[PDB]
């Protein structure tokens, strides 16, 4: 048994000292979530009894951590540790990760974590730091955890923040914070400014991205436009909204961005001459990557004819008016009249008279042509002779 799942199985005690190591010594995954565990010493004993514990899941358990400063067990084999809906703090997290030198994934969702100090010797190998559903974590708390060299994965969502700038990074410069953050999950956020993407573009190694459910990336008619703007803002981006960004789509987004912002670039003092290019500070701060792009890509009803119908031979009929298309051929009108008057189409004579030229009658003989070729305009009349 390598993968053990004991979710909602009522587990409160640990058992015998050595029974778990003797019954199933090849245990690699443990899913002891939502159990009857009311203390942390039991989980510590269970983890100590295992030697190949690679994944340990003990979320949704009401546990009380000891206040002592003694390292209660060391798990060098533990890598993935999920701790969600457990009510943990920053100090407890730092005390727990102090004994896990091989910890590579850590989940901390719905815990109300208040970051205060900077982890120095601890958290030196943790890559994923899922800090979701934490309204206490703001922008000032993400600066301290940004000095982790091994931090590569950051799932920070439903946090409430709407700005993440970088004071150590200027216009078009890379920031020292987050040296390996390549994908930060963004959802349930109230981002209503375009400076967030411009600040995230300054990351040293940013690739994937996911900005779902936001006031700027709503599921409306402006979703594609906002997606293209986000793609054109971050040049090193390779994935947006869990979707691969093709080179053609990126080129199209950048071209649309340039075409839409050329007016604002020229109104701020831009020019094709590098010696005369004097942009303002506001345009440089709002669009740091605009200079790179400028250097790369350089600097049936209307066709209707309301005409009347007359019959010189039969004056008892009324002068009716029809609306026929302009591209209608003569043969179609002849066939219409044939059935209309129950008259053979073989002996049908067609003519038109325009009010601009009174007294002149131009005949219509060729059936292969159209009404547009005979200069038939709107307001003319059709004469039917048979």
């Amino acid at each position: 048994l390598q993968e053990v799942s004991l979710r909602n199985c009522a587990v409160s005690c640990a058992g015998e000292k050595g029974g778990v190591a003797e019954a199933c010594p090849n245990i690699r995954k443990v899913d002891l979530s939502k159990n009857l565990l009311s203390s942390w010493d039991e989980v510590i004993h269970i983890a100590d009894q295992l030697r190949h514990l690679e994944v340990l899941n003990v979320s949704e358990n009401k546990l009380k951590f000891p206040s002592g400063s003694v390292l209660t067990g060391t798990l060098s084999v533990l890598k993935v540790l999920v701790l969600n809906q457990t009510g943990i703090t920053w100090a407890e997290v730092l005390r727990c990760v102090a004994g896990c030198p091989g910890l590579e994934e850590l989940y901390l969702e719905s815990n109300n974590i208040f970051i205060s100090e900077r982890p120095t010797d601890v958290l030196q190998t943790v890559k994923l730091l899922d800090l979701s559903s934490n309204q206490l974590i703001d922008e000032n708390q993400l600066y301290l955890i940004a000095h982790l060299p091994r931090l590569e994965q950051l799932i920070l969502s439903d946090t409430g923040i709407s700005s993440l700038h970088f004071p150590d990074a200027g216009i078009g410069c890379k920031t020292s914070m987050f040296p390996s953050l390549k994908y930060l999950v963004v959802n349930d956020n109230q981002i209503s400014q375009w400076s967030f993407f411009n600040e995230l573009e300054k990351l040293p190694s940013l690739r994937a991205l996911s900005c779902l459910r936001n006031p700027l990336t709503k599921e409306d008619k402006e979703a594609e436009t906002a997606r293209l703007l986000i793609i054109a803002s971050i040049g090193q981006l390779k994935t947006l909204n869990k979707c691969e960004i093709l080179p053609e789509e990126r080129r199209r987004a950048e071209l649309d961005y340039r075409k839409a912002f050329g007016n604002e670039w020229k109104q701020a003092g831009g020019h094709k001459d590098p010696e005369k290019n004097r942009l303002s500070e506001e345009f440089l701060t709002a669009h740091p990557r605009y200079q790179f792009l400028c250097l790369k890509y350089g600097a049936l009803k209307n066709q209707l004819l309301t005409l009347k119908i007359k019959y010189p031979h039969q004056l008892d009929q009324k002068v009716l008016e029809k609306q026929l298309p302009g591209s209608m051929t003569i043969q179609k009108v002849k066939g219409l009249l044939s059935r209309l008057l129950k008259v053979p189409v073989s002996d049908l004579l067609l003519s038109y008279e325009s009010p601009k030229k009174p007294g002149r009658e131009i005949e219509l003989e060729n059936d292969l042509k159209s009404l547009q070729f005979y200069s038939v305009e709107n307001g003319d009349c059709l004469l039917v002779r048979w």
């Binding site: 049936l300 009803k301 066709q303 209707l304 029809k322 026929l324 298309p325 591209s327 209608m328 179609k332 066939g335 219409l336 059935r339």
Partner: protein
């Protein structure tokens, strides 16, 4: 109706114009109280435009002439 929404917009426009001409020619195809709405819809529709905009209008004509709506995967 299947040709009314073709991939080529010129074919769509030609089919619409030909259908309008045939409806103006023959009068025993559609009733008197139905032909008026058909002519009003066919005249006030730009068949050389976004297919999503045009399609919606063609489904309308089918429902106005007693024709099942043809659909694709």
């Amino acid at each position: 109706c299947l040709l009314l929404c073709h991939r080529f917009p010129l074919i769509r426009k030609t089919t619409a114009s030909q259908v309008y001409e045939t409806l103006l020619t023959y009068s025993d195809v559609v009733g008197a109280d139905v032909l008026d709405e058909v002519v009003t819809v066919l005249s006030d529709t730009a068949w050389d435009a976004e297919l999503a905009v045009v399609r919606e209008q063609r489904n309308r004509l089918c429902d106005l002439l007693g024709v099942p709506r043809p659909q694709l995967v």
